[PDB]
Amino acid sequence: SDSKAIAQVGTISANSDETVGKLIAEAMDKVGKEGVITVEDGTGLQDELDVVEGMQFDRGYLSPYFINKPETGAVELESPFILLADKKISNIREMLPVLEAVAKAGKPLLIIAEDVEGEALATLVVNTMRGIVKVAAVKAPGFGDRRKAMLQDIATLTGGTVISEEIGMELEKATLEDLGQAKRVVINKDTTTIIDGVGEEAAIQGRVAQIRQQIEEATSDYDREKLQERVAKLAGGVAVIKVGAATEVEMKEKKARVEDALHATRAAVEEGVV
Amino acid sequence: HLFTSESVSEGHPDKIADQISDAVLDAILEQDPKARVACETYVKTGMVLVGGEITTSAWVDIEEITRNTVREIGYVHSDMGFDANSCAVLSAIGKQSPDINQGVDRADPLEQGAGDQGLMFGYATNETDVLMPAPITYAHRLVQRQAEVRKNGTLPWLRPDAKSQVTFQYDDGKIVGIDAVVLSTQHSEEIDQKSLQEAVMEEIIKPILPAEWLTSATKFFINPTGRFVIGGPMGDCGLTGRKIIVDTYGGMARHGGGAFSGKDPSKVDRSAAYAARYVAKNIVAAGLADRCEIQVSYAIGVAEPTSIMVETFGTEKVPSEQLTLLVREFFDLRPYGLIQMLDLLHPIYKETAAYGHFGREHFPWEKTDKAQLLRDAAG
Amino acid sequence: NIRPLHDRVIVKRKEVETKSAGGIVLTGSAAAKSTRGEVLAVGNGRILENGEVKPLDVKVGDIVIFNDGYGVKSEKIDNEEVLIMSESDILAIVE
Amino acid sequence: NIRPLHDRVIVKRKEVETKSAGGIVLTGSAAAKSTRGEVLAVGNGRILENGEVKPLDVKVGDIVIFNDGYGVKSEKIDNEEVLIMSESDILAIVE
Amino acid sequence: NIRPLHDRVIVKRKEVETKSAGGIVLTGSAAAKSTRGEVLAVGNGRILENGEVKPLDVKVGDIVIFNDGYGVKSEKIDNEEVLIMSESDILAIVE
């Protein structure tokens, strides 16, 4: 249970390398028990650890005119809305009510749709520049059924409801009850982060239990990895270990050793040590 | 046993050359019902060459056809080193033949003789619904899926160049699963490597291959070296007729090696193979056999076929003498007789140029309307 | 100066609006062509089968609602586009 | 105030009912656009061939049954969708 | 209840018989839609060119033979489909 034993197991499992064992123990302590730790090859000469708190997806802003903080090259929204849509967008006519309603309040709004065409981008950017309503647009992350699954996950965590055309829900009739909330949102060129959502907890436990039980029936370890990553993203944290070596051969050797140490530490936590 | 079939996309120079040759053939056939066409195409970096012997009473300019055809694949940019409009096409075709009046006289079209000597083969198995070997069929479907997605615009950074390899294992002569799936495709530089394989496997690999045939032992390979940005005619020499084995069956059936693209229906090197597949598909759809092949032989300057042989691999429900008897008295194997009953003299060879000449229901030679009659006769 | 013949009427349409039921600003294809205008001059009247002329119901200076179509022709006068149409294209009188 | 010309009437169609002979809710293509509405303003009357005017048979406040088509024109008045259509395009009067 | 306007009448089509000229019960597309019905109400009358009214020949309660086409419009009244049609589409009257 203690971090000393985990560090010792990781050290022994990596050909007596104390640095990787200590790094793995620290990462496991930071992330916790319900989380994902993965290893990717780095670019520097020494290993580094990067941990992500909350959830984030690899989707960025559509247009460079949304950034209100050019110093960091990223846009920050304070207490915004979240609008979830699965249909392609090419005309603004379906969002006049929601945009006018949220402009009547003042605090910002965020749009998560699978794709928005330039016709709506024009009105959105001109409205943001003229200082009437502050909005941002990000593409829906992923593809296929996984995309809708993670859209539902975002809806559950942010305390809102998804808007799907196939379930007979239209965006014209949407109102503030169908929009979620979040403490802060940070969007850069490649990632979008939702910070401290206001969803109900029991829904969170229900969703994580559903995905956890769905893990069992999966036959490919790739699907198991994806669903475990989804569980960690919805609840918990995700950490990545970037191993560093001068040459590609040493890179592969160190990566294999670190993966072996990770597996050994996981098994020791699960069952115990002798 | 472990067998692998490989298919290529329409953006490859050889497939580009094949498409050009068949596009000209359809245009010539549309203008001239009874033209003679024997053409070949060569494509390189910025230079396109066409040649052969085409004897027809009509005239067609090849420039507008080539630009229209190349634009169809999607070569409308100079980023890959080949653009439709910026390129140049030259003609090296002899539009006239000395023998246009000496041999104009004909005795009887129904007794026309074969212009070539050789033996042709057919093949058909009930492993797939399309009556075709599975590994080649699914390899064609994968690259077909990639083009449809690329044309749909949902995946705009994909490039025409793509290659797929599918591996199938057989236990007691039956399919039991999928071993390894490889899809090699060219992409734009904006998207990183990690996001690249995720899109292709979940939208091309996933909704095409059967789910019940995929197990935990299946291995998915995407971009083995890691960077397939370089492609197009710049990276490889282009010429016509080099992968006939890929187009016909993928190696599961013995083939005569005769080139298909750029040839008129008059030559038996193309049409007679179509009839053999038509006969083989018909004789197997009736349930008379699990697999069957038709061996038809022709001699240059000889009208009547020398020999017709049928082989079944011992799966026949009736003696082979009955099988040979039925095909002779129910199928017209005449070199001109099969032309009339398969009505190939129509501008339909453009779509056949890519994605395999066989394995599509809409093709005239892939119909199974005669299967019911043979079942009654042999029953 | 242009004088229409018979029952035709020359109008000029209003500029397209920017704000739409609030602060939302529409640009490009979002803002459609205006479907209203003001009448500048009115025709003499419609020719009846009898031969008499029936004066047009629309008067100078009014505001009309019209439907664009093959009957409405766009003419540029004094570097300003004006619309020439019959009275049948006019649907209603505003205020 | 909007008043039509000749024999045109402006109507406002009723809302699309979801419940159908019970608590079942119809969505999508199951429920189509309504075909009943009430008149807001009535035209002066149709123009006869000789030149006389004939008063219309519809009074303000009646509920009418019409058929939507090419001749029916939709215009936005006071941020409310109303239909401008001829008197001959209505079928019957409810009650 | 509704009443038609001008030259329109409202009819209800009778049920199609199954046993035709004997015990042969017809099912499927063989039992074509009935082309005969009974009038429920009669319109005011067609407006002539001079403006007069010509009373309709059909009287309420009679049985009429008509042809189904584009001019016939169906309306859901009291959860019972009826037909809205002009007198020009009425072919004959039974008895």
Side-chain angles (χ1 to χ4, degrees), chain A residues 1-52 54-200 202-274, chain B residues 1-94 96-101 103-105 107-110 112-379, chain C residues 1-14 16 18 20-28 30-32 34-37 39-45 47-48 50-51 53 55-69 71-72 74 77-79 82-94, chain D residues 1-14 16 18 20-28 30-32 34-37 39-45 47-48 50-51 53 55-69 71-72 74 77-79 82-94, chain E residues 1-14 16 18 20-28 30-32 34-37 39-45 47-48 50-51 53 55-69 71-72 74 77-79 82-94:
Chain A
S1 52
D2 45 354
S3 295
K4 172 178 275 289
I6 285 162
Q8 288 172 327
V9 170
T11 293
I12 296 309
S13 187
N15 199 0
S16 304
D17 189 359
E18 308 217 339
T19 302
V20 59
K22 164 167 51 63
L23 193 146
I24 288 174
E26 198 263 333
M28 185 180 288
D29 171 68
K30 279 208 301 216
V31 165
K33 299 301 180 188
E34 174 185 330
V36 173
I37 308 158
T38 180
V39 185
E40 301 116 320
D41 51 353
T43 57
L45 183 63
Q46 63 214 10
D47 314 332
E48 61 180 355
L49 169 69
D50 163 78
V51 61
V52 177
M55 62 175 308
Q56 74 161 44
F57 40 95
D58 42 358
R59 274 313 194 287
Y61 63 89
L62 273 296
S63 167
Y65 304 110
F66 285 139
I67 296 91
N68 51 0
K69 285 171 197 208
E71 63 267 16
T72 61
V75 63
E76 276 72 16
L77 279 73
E78 187 81 50
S79 187
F81 286 78
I82 297 89
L83 189 151
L84 304 159
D86 54 330
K87 61 190 76 62
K88 62 101 176 181
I89 302 304
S90 182
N91 45 359
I92 197 51
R93 304 310 340 281
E94 50 260 20
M95 301 155 208
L96 272 296
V98 59
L99 270 68
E100 74 193 336
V102 302
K104 277 180 58 59
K107 64 213 181 63
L109 183 146
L110 183 62
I111 292 170
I112 297 89
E114 74 91 21
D115 199 356
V116 187
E117 301 299 329
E119 185 65 30
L121 271 293
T123 175
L124 286 179
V125 301
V126 72
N127 286 295
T128 45
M129 300 151 34
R130 219 164 294 261
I132 297 169
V133 61
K134 37 193 83 183
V135 311
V138 293
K139 297 185 191 292
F143 293 100
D145 168 51
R146 184 177 163 264
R147 171 199 262 159
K148 277 74 69 177
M150 67 185 97
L151 266 175
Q152 176 63 256
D153 296 323
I154 298 168
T156 50
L157 159 66
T158 198
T161 61
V162 70
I163 294 166
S164 184
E165 202 182 19
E166 65 87 13
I167 193 166
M169 207 56 257
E170 286 280 13
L171 172 43
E172 291 84 1
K173 276 80 66 177
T175 175
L176 281 73
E177 73 205 49
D178 291 331
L179 303 192
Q181 273 214 70
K183 177 189 174 185
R184 286 216 298 109
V185 171
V186 173
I187 312 165
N188 64 7
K189 302 82 160 174
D190 46 356
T191 62
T192 296
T193 298
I194 293 156
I195 300 185
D196 207 2
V198 188
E200 201 265 333
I204 297 169
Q205 284 91 22
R207 275 298 281 201
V208 302
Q210 179 171 3
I211 305 149
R212 271 200 276 95
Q213 76 173 356
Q214 278 180 226
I215 288 172
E216 293 178 353
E217 282 90 7
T219 48
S220 164
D221 299 330
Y222 188 77
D223 273 28
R224 268 94 168 274
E225 288 172 350
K226 272 194 173 294
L227 281 53
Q228 289 222 312
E229 214 284 333
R230 209 195 272 160
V231 173
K233 200 157 281 302
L234 193 152
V238 178
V240 298
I241 298 171
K242 281 174 280 296
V243 294
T247 301
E248 188 80 50
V249 191
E250 190 161 271
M251 182 46 97
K252 303 214 204 270
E253 179 76 25
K254 191 92 170 295
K255 190 174 185 293
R257 283 205 275 123
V258 175
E259 277 169 349
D260 272 13
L262 208 54
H263 285 108
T265 51
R266 192 178 304 158
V269 166
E270 170 180 329
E271 282 205 359
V273 299
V274 292
Chain B
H1 312 67
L2 302 173
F3 194 30
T4 293
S5 291
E6 177 197 306
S7 186
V8 300
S9 66
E10 62 198 6
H12 295 285
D14 57 356
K15 300 298 289 185
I16 294 282
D18 291 331
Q19 279 173 100
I20 295 293
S21 298
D22 272 335
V24 176
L25 172 73
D26 283 331
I28 295 303
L29 194 151
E30 176 57 42
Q31 273 180 33
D32 203 4
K34 189 178 184 293
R36 200 171 327 289
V37 166
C39 169
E40 62 93 15
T41 46
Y42 193 105
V43 65
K44 63 182 77 174
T45 299
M47 172 76 267
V48 184
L49 190 153
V50 68
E53 164 72 344
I54 297 89
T55 300
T56 175
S57 67
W59 70 258
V60 176
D61 183 71
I62 64 168
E63 205 63 37
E64 71 274 16
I65 301 299
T66 314
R67 310 284 145 167
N68 201 4
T69 302
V70 170
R71 180 219 31 76
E72 205 81 49
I73 297 89
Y75 280 85
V76 70
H77 211 276
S78 57
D79 272 1
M80 70 285 308
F82 185 79
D83 194 0
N85 282 281
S86 79
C87 194
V89 178
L90 271 297
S91 63
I93 296 166
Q96 309 281 61
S97 87
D99 283 331
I100 46 171
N101 291 318
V104 66
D105 190 359
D108 190 55
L110 270 299
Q112 281 311 138
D116 186 74
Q117 185 147 39
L119 197 149
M120 281 75 78
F121 296 95
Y123 192 86
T125 53
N126 44 227
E127 306 189 284
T128 63
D129 56 306
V130 299
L131 278 298
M132 185 64 72
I136 176 61
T137 315
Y138 291 136
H140 278 330
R141 198 162 302 171
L142 272 174
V143 295
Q144 212 176 1
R145 175 54 184 196
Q146 186 269 346
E148 265 152 21
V149 173
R150 182 164 72 90
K151 293 300 184 293
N152 263 15
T154 61
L155 270 293
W157 59 83
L158 310 193
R159 295 290 184 268
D161 289 331
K163 181 218 70 194
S164 80
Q165 267 193 29
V166 178
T167 74
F168 267 44
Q169 76 159 331
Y170 291 83
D171 212 359
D172 216 337
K174 287 193 284 287
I175 298 169
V176 297
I178 288 163
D179 299 329
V181 186
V182 190
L183 198 148
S184 293
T185 179
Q186 179 184 358
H187 72 109
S188 189
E189 69 271 53
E190 292 78 350
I191 172 169
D192 54 353
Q193 180 59 253
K194 178 184 53 187
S195 185
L196 180 64
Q197 87 261 15
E198 207 276 344
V200 66
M201 62 95 58
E202 182 266 321
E203 289 180 352
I204 294 172
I205 297 313
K206 199 151 296 299
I208 294 298
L209 294 174
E212 59 91 10
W213 273 351
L214 289 165
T215 78
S216 61
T218 307
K219 319 164 188 179
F220 302 101
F221 277 20
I222 297 154
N223 294 108
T225 67
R227 187 182 192 268
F228 287 8
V229 191
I230 287 155
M234 181 145 68
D236 197 45
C237 201
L239 62 85
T240 303
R242 54 211 311 199
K243 64 162 41 63
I244 300 300
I245 183 167
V246 169
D247 298 15
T248 60
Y249 298 103
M252 301 216 78
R254 294 289 319 121
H255 205 57
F260 273 141
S261 177
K263 266 164 181 205
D264 54 354
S266 300
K267 185 45 94 182
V268 300
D269 291 331
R270 163 204 272 280
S271 176
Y274 292 171
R277 163 70 183 180
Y278 176 49
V279 166
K281 188 182 186 183
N282 269 355
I283 201 165
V284 75
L288 270 183
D290 303 77
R291 54 200 43 99
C292 168
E293 299 84 31
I294 299 298
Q295 313 147 39
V296 291
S297 61
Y298 285 85
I300 183 166
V302 176
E304 188 65 37
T306 62
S307 73
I308 294 173
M309 191 85 158
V310 65
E311 191 276 331
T312 306
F313 292 100
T315 65
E316 50 196 71
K317 317 294 177 230
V318 296
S320 162
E321 193 173 1
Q322 272 75 12
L323 284 164
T324 310
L325 204 74
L326 262 64
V327 61
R328 294 280 201 63
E329 69 195 279
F330 292 109
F331 289 98
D332 200 358
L333 277 296
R334 280 307 309 201
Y336 206 49
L338 60 85
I339 297 297
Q340 182 45 241
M341 69 155 299
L342 273 297
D343 68 7
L344 312 173
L345 271 298
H346 300 90
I348 56 166
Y349 302 112
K350 170 62 188 259
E351 62 274 40
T352 52
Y355 291 157
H357 278 222
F358 303 133
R360 281 177 247 184
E361 58 88 20
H362 47 279
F363 291 162
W365 50 78
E366 288 263 346
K367 298 321 198 196
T368 61
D369 55 73
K370 281 219 67 183
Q372 62 183 357
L373 188 153
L374 304 190
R375 187 51 152 115
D376 213 28
Chain C
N1 194 3
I2 312 175
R3 193 200 86 179
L5 281 167
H6 299 277
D7 62 318
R8 275 181 198 79
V9 159
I10 56 173
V11 300
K12 65 182 181 180
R13 57 166 83 220
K14 311 304 196 40
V16 298
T18 79
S20 64
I24 312 302
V25 173
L26 275 73
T27 61
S34 180
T35 301
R36 196 185 264 90
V39 55
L40 292 178
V42 69
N44 271 342
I47 280 294
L48 296 156
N50 189 359
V53 285
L56 312 188
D57 263 358
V58 297
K59 305 152 301 312
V60 64
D62 291 338
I63 301 98
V64 299
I65 313 160
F66 55 92
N67 44 1
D68 293 28
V72 184
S74 54
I77 62 164
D78 291 26
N79 203 1
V82 294
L83 294 174
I84 311 171
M85 52 165 158
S86 299
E87 65 182 1
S88 295
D89 291 331
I90 295 181
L91 294 198
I93 281 283
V94 162
Chain D
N1 191 2
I2 296 89
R3 49 186 275 255
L5 274 300
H6 305 286
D7 64 354
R8 296 196 187 74
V9 289
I10 58 173
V11 297
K12 176 194 170 224
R13 57 207 322 172
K14 310 299 200 43
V16 190
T18 61
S20 300
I24 187 166
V25 166
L26 279 77
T27 61
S34 177
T35 187
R36 301 166 153 79
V39 293
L40 307 169
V42 67
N44 224 26
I47 285 291
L48 274 74
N50 45 4
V53 65
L56 293 182
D57 307 68
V58 189
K59 311 315 208 291
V60 173
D62 291 331
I63 301 102
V64 307
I65 304 171
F66 57 92
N67 48 1
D68 204 308
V72 191
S74 173
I77 292 172
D78 201 76
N79 296 115
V82 297
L83 283 72
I84 297 169
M85 51 165 208
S86 296
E87 211 275 348
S88 84
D89 291 331
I90 75 173
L91 280 72
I93 288 172
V94 173
Chain E
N1 66 282
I2 73 168
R3 79 168 194 86
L5 280 181
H6 298 281
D7 202 4
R8 312 210 179 62
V9 297
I10 58 175
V11 311
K12 66 182 290 294
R13 38 178 50 184
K14 316 145 60 194
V16 58
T18 61
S20 60
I24 316 301
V25 170
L26 296 174
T27 61
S34 182
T35 187
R36 174 171 307 98
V39 292
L40 281 190
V42 55
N44 181 9
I47 297 290
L48 295 159
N50 68 338
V53 286
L56 306 195
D57 282 308
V58 285
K59 195 162 301 213
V60 58
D62 296 0
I63 303 99
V64 304
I65 306 103
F66 58 94
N67 63 186
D68 206 318
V72 183
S74 191
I77 296 159
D78 291 331
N79 273 348
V82 296
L83 299 168
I84 316 297
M85 52 187 320
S86 181
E87 197 197 346
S88 307
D89 279 278
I90 297 284
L91 267 57
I93 298 162
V94 164

